[PDB]
Structure 1
Amino acid sequence: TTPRFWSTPLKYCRWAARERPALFFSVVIGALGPVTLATVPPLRRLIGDVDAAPIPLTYPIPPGPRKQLKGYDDDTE
Structure 2
Amino acid sequence: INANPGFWNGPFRYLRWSAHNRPHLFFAFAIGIAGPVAALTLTPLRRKYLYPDHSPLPQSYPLPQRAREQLTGFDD
- So what's the TM-score if we normalise by structure 2? 0.84
- Other-structure match for 1:40: 42
- Other-structure match for 2:29: 27
CA distance in 1, matches of 2:69, 2:20: 71
- Other-structure match for 2:15: 13
Q: How many Å apart are 1:27 and its aligned residue?
A: 1.0
Unmatched tracts of structure 1, length 5 or more: none
Kindly report structure 1 stretches of 4+ aligned residues shifted beyond 6 Å.
Answer: none
What is the aligned residue count? 74
Unmatched tracts of structure 2, length 5 or more: none
- So what's the TM-score if we normalise by structure 1? 0.84
